[model samples]
Target: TFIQKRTHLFACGIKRKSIKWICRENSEKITVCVPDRKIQLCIANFLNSRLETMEKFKEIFLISVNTEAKLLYNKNEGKDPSIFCNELRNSFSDFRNSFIGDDMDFGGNTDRVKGYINKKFSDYYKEKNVEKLNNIKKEWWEKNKANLWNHMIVNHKGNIAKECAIIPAEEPQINLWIKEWNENFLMEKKRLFLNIKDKCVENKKYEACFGGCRLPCSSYTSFMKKSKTQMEVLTNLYKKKNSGVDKNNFLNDLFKKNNKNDLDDFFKNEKEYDDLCDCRYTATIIKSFLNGPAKNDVDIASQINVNDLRGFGCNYKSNNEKSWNCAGTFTNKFPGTCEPPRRQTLCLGRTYLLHRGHEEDYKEHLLGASIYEAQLLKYKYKEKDENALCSIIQNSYADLADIIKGSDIIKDYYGKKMEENLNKVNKDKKRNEESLKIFREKWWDENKENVWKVMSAVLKNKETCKDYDKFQKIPQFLRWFKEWGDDFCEKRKEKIYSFESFKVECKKKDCTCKNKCSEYKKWIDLKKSEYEKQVDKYTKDKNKKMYDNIDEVKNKEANVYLKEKSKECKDVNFDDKIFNEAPNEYEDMCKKCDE
Candidate 1:
C-alpha cells in the first residue's frame, strides 16, 4: 500500500496519470481558483507569452539541450500508464530546472541519453516495478512507520488517515503494518524515526512547526539566496519599474558620451545622484542579465565604447583620493605613471583604509571580505549625489565608532570589577583558612570517640567485617577528622614563636590536652595527687585533739559505710525484718549501726 496525503502530493509524483486526473484544472477552473486581481493579471501575462503553438513548445521541449522535459522522457517511455498519470510531475521537474538548473549532469555520461531518461523517468519507472518497489517501500515504511505517518499527516492535514480514497479503512491496516515495521526495523537500527503524524501533532500542541513552508530548516540562508535569484527572474518577467535595461543603457551611454571630468561632475552633484534614483535594483538586474544572457552574445559594451576603470574616475588618472583608494593605489601612484601619495593615510586612516595597495594580499582575504564595504563603495561612487555618498559614509563611521566605544567601555568596566572581585576573593580565602584551622582542631577532639564507635560497630558484623582497611576505605568523616585535626595542631605549634626556646621544646610533644581523652587523663592524674595530699595532711594532724577521738572516728566510718551500702541497695533489707517485740531493742540496733 502506498502512503498518501490530502493537502498536497509530492511534486515528484504529480507526473502520475491517476494524480493528474484527480487534480487537473481546466482553464475556466483555474480562473475560478485564482480570483485575485494581481494573480489573474500575472496569469494573463504568462499565458500571453505562451501564445506560440503547442507543437513549437513540444519541439523546443524535445530538442532543448539538457532540459527537464527532455530528461524526463529520456528516463521512461512516455506511453507508460503510470508515467501518463503523473503529468504534473513532468511539468514541475521542468519548472524546477528552469529556475535551479539540472546540476546532476557533470563529467561525461557514458550512457548519456539512457542516463538522462533513467533520472527523468525514475518516479514513473518505480511505479512500473510494483513488486520490487513495494518491497523497498515496505522496508522504508517499516523502518520509518511513524515518520511516514507524520510526513503524510503533516502535508495532507490529517487527510491521509481520514480520507477514504487515500487510507480506505477506519483504522487502516497500514497503521498495524507501520507498528510491525517499526518493531522489526528497530531491532537493527540504533535510532528510530518519529512518525510525521506524531511530530505534527506534537508541534500542533506546542505550535512549533512552520505552517506551510517546506524548505528544510537547517539551510535557511541557502533557501533565501535561491529565493532572491528567483525574484530576479520574476522581476525580469514582470517588467517592473526597476528593471535593469534602462539603468544599464544609461550608464553605458553616459560613460560613452562624456569625458572623465564631465562624468565626475555628473556623479558628484547631489541632485543628479538623486535623479539617478541610486538605482540599486536596476544595477543588480543589469549586472545579472549582462553576465548571464549577454555574455559573449551581445556587442552592447563595445557599441557604447565604454571606458575602463581609469576613464570612469574609478582609478588614479582622475587624481581623486577616493578613486585611488578604489583602484588599490592609495599608498602608491597610478599603474603606469609615477605620482606622490595623495594623502598620508589614504581615504580614511591607515587602520580603516579599505583599498590600500597590497592590503588585499593578506592571507585572510581568501577566506572572506566585507560585502557591505563593497556595496557602500558601489553606492558612493556610482551614485549621482554628494549627500547620498555622505549619508552612506556617515552611517558606516557611526556604526564603527559605536561598536568600538561600546566594546571599550565594556572592557574597562569588567576589568575594574574583576580587580575588586579579586580583592574580595583574597579576603574570603584568608577567612576560610582561619575557619579551617579551627574546624580541624574541633574535628580532632570530636571524632576520636566517633572513630572508636565505628570500629566497634564494624566488629559487630563478624561475618562481613573485614579489617579496618576495608572499613576505612569506605568514606567516614570521623577518620578524616582525626587525621586533619592532628595535622592542624602540629602546624599551629610550629607557628608559635613567642614562647621561650626551652618551654617550646618541653611543650612540643607533650599533652596539650584540648580534646576529650587528653582532658580526661589530666583530670585523673590531678585527682590521684589530691588524694595522696589529703592522706598526708590527715597523718600530720593525727596528734591533735581531733585525732584523740579514734573510737568516735571508727564509729562514724562504720555509720557512713552502712548508710552508703543501704543507699546503694535502695534502702531495703535482703532478709525479712524481725518482729520488734519492744521499741527499746529497735533503738539499740539503730545506735549500734550509727556507731
Candidate 2:
C-alpha cells in the first residue's frame, strides 16, 4: 500500500457585489458566496501564484471592498486603480523625500525633527521684517499647498515603510508554516473527498472524480442529501462558537495564569496553534497593514452575524516582521488581490479639494486626523498629546467657537456637551462644600458643650473637693477655661473657611496663659487640678473653725435652766408648812421650774 500525504487548503469565496432584496420583510441580505474549488490544494496554489509579485496588493483589494471610501477620497480623478498603482510602484524613487534604496535609514525621533524645522523657520523668519515674513509665509503656503501635501503623502508612505519594516527573508518560514498547518487540514478534507469519490465510483461515473459530486455525478442528488445533514451540523457548531462568550476572557485568563510569555510560546507550537493564532499579538501588525494608518477607515458599518464570517479577515504570520510585505502578498493572492496606493492618494486629494472650497470642513477633518495621529503616537511611544485636538476642545472654547462659527448644529452639540461638563463640576464642588460645612458645625457644637460642662462642674463643686493647692498653682489653667472658651466659640460660631476673609485662630493670644490652649486636653487637665486645690484649702480651714466654735457655745443654755430648777425646789418645801395660801404662789413657781 502507498501512503499519500494530503493537506486541505482553506480559501474563502468571492463576495457578491449585488444585494438580495426582500420585498416582504423590507430587508436585504448582502450575499457572499464561497469558493468553487473542491480540492484545497488548487485554492492554495491559485492564491500563492497570484499574490507573489504585487506590492501594496492589500491597498488595491480595499478599493473593491469599500467603494464608498474610495469615492470619498478619489472621485473621478481620471487615474484610479491603474494609475494609482503606477504612483505607488514608483513612489520610492520619483518623490523628493522618497529614498531610492531599501537600505536608506528613515526611522528617528519625530519631535527632534519638528524642533529642528521650527528653529530653522524661526531664525529665517526673524531675519526678515514682520510684514516680509508674513508675505513669505503666504507665498510659501500658496506655492507649496498641493505640492506640500504630496510631499507629506510621500513622507507618510515612507513612514509606513519604516513603520511596517519587516524582513522579506522570513517569507519562506511563513510559507512553511502555512504548508504545515494545511497538511493537518488536509486530513479533514480527505474525508470529504473520499465520501464524494466513493459515491462517484459507485455511480460508475469515473469522469466525475475530477470535480467530485460538484461535476453533476449520477450520485449528486444522494450525495447532497448526506452533505446537507453534515453541513447542518457544521453550521450549527460554527454559529455556537461565534455566539459564545467573547474570546477576550479566555485569552485574558490564559495570560493571567501563565503570563503572555507562556501564551506566546503556546502560539508558536505547531500542534497547539489554530484559530487563536490570528487573535494574538501578530494580528495587530497584520491589522495595521490591512487598515489604513488611521483606524476609522476600516469601520465595518454593517451589522455582523454568525453566518457572516466571510467578512472577517483571517490572521496570518508575516515574514521578517514586514507587515506591508506580508499584507501586500496576502491581499494580492487568496480570495482577492490587494488594492494599491491610489486609494490613499485619491482620498487625500479629495480632502485637499474639500479644503479649497470649505474652510470649516477642512479644519474639522484636520482636527479628526490630528486626534487619530495623536492617539497613534500615544500608543506607539506611550507619551501624551498635550495639545491633542480633544484637549484643545476641552480647554479652548474660543478656538472651538471660532472653528465652528458657521455650523449651528456643531455649535449646539459642542456647547451642550461643554455646559454639561461645567454643570457636573459645579455640582460636585457644591456638594463637597456642603458636606464640609455640616461636619465643621456639628464638630464644634459637640466640643463646645463638653468644654462648658467641664468648666462649670469644676467651679461649682470647688468647696466640696480637697484639691485647692493644685488649682491655685496653675495660672495657665485659669486662663484657658475662664477666658479662651468664650473668645474661641464667639469667633468660630458662624465663620467658615472663606478664601478672602477668614484667618486661623491662634490659641495663645485669646487666653491669659498665652499658649496653654495650644494643647486643649492638657489645659483642661490643669484647670481641673486648680479647681480641686481650691476645694481642698477651703475644706481644711472650715473643718478647724467648726470644732472651736462648737465647744464654746454647746452647754451655756442647758446649765442656766438647771440652776433655776434647784432654786425652785428649796422654796416649795418652806411654803408647804407656813401658809396654805402663801405656799400656793410658791408652789406654782416651783411647779413652773420643775416643768
Candidate 3:
C-alpha cells in the first residue's frame, strides 16, 4: 500500500493492475485511483529515479533515456501518454553516467558517447543481451503493467500473522531514505513530535526559551549608516554645487569635510559591526543639538530607509533615561500609536523560531542567526499570516537541506548564499557545515509543522515590543548592567606588583612547578577577589552618583563603551594562567608523580 502525506511512495499487489497514487499537491494522505496507463508513467518515474531498483531493472533507465532523449532530440513525442518530466529530463545524463558506473567504453574512443552507445547496440545485433532486450521488456511490462490485471497478482494469514514478501521501495536512495525516515524514525517519534508541539502550543515553553525581544538598539545611527552611501554621493554633488574654478572644488574641499571633523570619522565607524550603534540615540541627540533641529520635519523623515536596524520589535522610543512608559501599542498602528521597536527586533524572534534546536551543532546558530538572516525574517513573517510564515520557513529548511543534499535545489531565495555561508563557515573544508546543514534542515522539516502549530499559537496576534525600556526604566538597566560592566569590563586592578606567573614547566619528573602553578593561581584569585570588592564599593558610589546625575548618566553611549570594554576583556585569555609558558627545568614535587 502506498502511503500519502509523504515525499515518497510504496507498492503492494493487493489489486491486480490497480493504480493508486496520492496526488502530489494534496495535503491529505488519501490515495486516488488513477488510470491504468497513468500508473505506468508514475511507476516509471519512481523506478527511473531509484538507483537500486533501477539496477534490478536497468531496462527502465535506458528505455527512459533513449525514449525521452530521442523525443526531445527528435522533437516528436507528444503528451498523449508520455511526457518527459523535467527532473528526469534534467537528471538523465547524470543518471546514465551513474547507472553504467565504470563500464562505459569512453577512455579511448573516437567519440566516447556515440561509440559507447553504438558499441552496445552493435553488441545487441550479435544476438547478445540486447537481442534479449525485448524478452526482458515483455516480461517487465506484463508483470508491472499490461498483463497484470489480465493474468495474476498475494495472500496473508495471521494470528500473529503477516503477509508474504512485502517489497520495499528501492533504487532512488532519497525515496528509500524518506521511507526509512518515516517508518524507522518518524513513526517512533510521531507522538514525541506532538508532545513537543503541545508544550509550545499550550505552555509556550518555546517562547519562554525564546523570549519576546526585550533589548533595544539605536534608530539614529541606523538611520545615519543607511544615509551613509547617500551622503557620499550627495557630498560629491555638494562639492560641485557651484561647479567652477571660482567656487573651486578646493574651497568646497575645505568645507568638503576632511579628517576635518569627527562626524566624518564617526560615520565610518558606524558602518562597522561594532558598539557604535549602541551610542546611536545619544549621538543622534548630540548631532541634533550640534546642527540644531532638522530644517523641517521632512529632514528627519527623509532620513528613513527601507531597511534600518530599529531595535527589538515593539520597541519604545525615549529621550528620558527613566522608566519611560513603553508608549508602544501593538503594531496594529505601531511606530506611532506605540513607539516602533527596532527593525532588528522584528526578526529576532522569528529567527529564533528557525533555530530552536538547529543550532545543536553550532549551538551558536540561534545567537548567530540573530544577525545572520535577521533583517527580513521578522518583516516577512509578520507581514505574512502565520500559515504563510510556516510555509516560508519550511521552504527555507527544505532549500537549505537541498544544499547539503543538493547543489541545484539551492536555487530559491538565497541563490548561492546559503552554500557560500556554509562553505565560509566550514573552517572558516566542510562536511560539518554540510553536516549541520543536512541535520538542521532535515530535523526542521520534520518538526516544522509541529513548530508551526505551536509558533502560530504563540506568535500570531500576540507580538509585543517596546518593553525593553522597562528594564532600563526600572533602574536595573543602569545599576546592574553598569556594575556588571565595570566589574567585568574594566582593567584588572591588582594589589600585587606582578602576576605570579613565573613557574617551571612540568613533566613526569617535574610536579613542583605545576604545584607552584597552583600556588600562583591562588594569588591571582585573591587579586580577583580584591577587585570584586573594589568594584562593589565603586558601584555603590558610582551608582549613587549616577542616580543623582540621572539626567546625564542615562546616556546610552556609556553603556556602549562599557560593553565594548567588557568584550575586549572577554576576548582576553586571562584564565590561560601563563602556565603553558613555564620554564622547562623543574623538580618533582610529590610521590604521587614519582609513582
Best by lDDT: 3
Candidate 2 residue-wise lDDT, 393-421, digit = tens:
12122222222222111223333332232
All candidates: TM-score: 0.14, 0.11, 0.18
Mind giving the per-residue lDDT tens digits that candidate 1 earns over 520-542? 33533443343233333333333
Best model number under TM-score: 3
Candidate 2 TM-score, C-alpha based: 0.11
Query: lDDT values of the candidates?
Result: 0.27, 0.27, 0.31
When summed lDDT is taken over every stretch of 10 residues in candidate 1, the lowest stretch is 34-43
Sort by lDDT, best first: what order? Answer: 3, 2, 1
lDDT of the structure predicted as candidate 3: 0.31
Q: Model 1, 259: alpha-carbon shift in Å?
A: 46
Which residue runs of candidate 3 sit more than 4 Å off their true CA positions? 1-136, 143-193, 203-595
Worst-scoring 10-residue span by lDDT in model 3:
152-161
Residue 340, candidate 1: how far off, in angstroms? 44
Q: Model 3, 253-362: lDDT tens per residue? A: 43334333432653454332222222222223223322434212323312322312332222222323221122323222211111112211222222223322223222
